[PDB]
């Protein structure tokens, strides 16, 4: 806390959707951290700094698409995120800070970390430097969210178990929907799943969940 042919129509086609998802994910991260600031007004300056970070990342990932001569399929990306975006919006409107934090700071960050770690060894030299820069910049020891959830665990255990039950399957469906395009990019779905589960288990351990609790939570993916 072998390399694909980056110039082929097959590669560019799959990249148009993967690149769009990463770009949209970064925009949504910016919007979510600002929204979280309305729930945690004393966290506004840290959340503004984290939102500026994600926008820097959005620009770097936009340049990855441009460098390969690929037009990002933004409509596909907006639809890909719509279920999780809807649940974040519902929790936000209800003032459900633990749900908002689990979605953004835990699920989405672990999803991003796994994607970046899996992509790095199979990426083009331009995108590799951008992605490595993004991982060597997803940072505090604990996120605004480990740290707030670690500090507030006793008041929000049941909501966290509910948020996980509702949102972890959405993350699994997202991984299923993009597995084909990820394989075109020479990424193995099993590596993505393994890295996500490890990153998510690490965050849950840090927050104060025990092994049995984590096992039951990870099982909600099915
Ligand atoms: C239940 C296992 O779920 C496995 C999910 O594995 C991750 C597969 O994701 C590959 C698609 C790439 C999407 C990257 C998301 C970018 C979000 C960046 C937002 C920054 O906080
Ligand atoms: Fe990011
Ligand atoms: Fe992030």
Swiss-Prot record:
Keywords: Iron, Lyase, Metal-binding, NADP. InterPro entries: Ald_deCOase, Ferritin-like, Ferritin-like_SF. Fe cation 1 binds at residues 26, 54, 57. The keyword Cell division does not apply. Its EC number is 4.1.99.5. One of its GO terms (molecular function) is transition metal ion binding. This is Aldehyde decarbonylase. The lineage of its organism: Bacteria, Bacillati, Cyanobacteriota, Cyanophyceae, Synechococcales.
């Amino acid at each position: 806390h072998a390399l694909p042919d980056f110039t082929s129509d097959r590669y560019k086609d799959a990249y148009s959707r993967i690149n769009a998802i990463v770009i949209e994910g970064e925009q949504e991260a910016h919007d979510n951290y600002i929204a979280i600031g309305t729930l945690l007004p004393d966290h506004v300056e840290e959340l503004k700094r984290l939102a500026k970070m994600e926008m820097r990342h959005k620009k770097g990932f936009t340049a990855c698409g441009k460098n390969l001569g690929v037009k990002a399929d933004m409509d596909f990306a907006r639809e890909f995120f719509a279920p999780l975006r809807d649940n974040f919006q519902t929790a936000l409107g209800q003032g459900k800070t633990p749900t908002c934090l689990l979605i953004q700071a835990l699920l989405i960050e672990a999803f991003a970390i796994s994607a970046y770690h899996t992509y790095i060894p199979v990426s083009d030299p331009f995108a590799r430097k951008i992605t490595e820069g993004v991982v060597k910049d997803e940072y505090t020891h604990l996120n605004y969210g480990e740290a707030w959830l670690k500090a507030n665990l006793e008041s929000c255990r049941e909501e966290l178990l509910e948020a996980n039950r509702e949102n972890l399957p959405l993350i699994r469906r997202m991984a299923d929907q993009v597995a084909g395009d990820a394989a075109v990019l020479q990424m193995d779905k099993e590596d993505l799943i393994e890295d996500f589960l490890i990153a998510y288990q690490e965050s849950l351990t840090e927050i104060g969940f025990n092994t049995r609790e984590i096992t039951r939570m990870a099982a909600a993916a099915l």
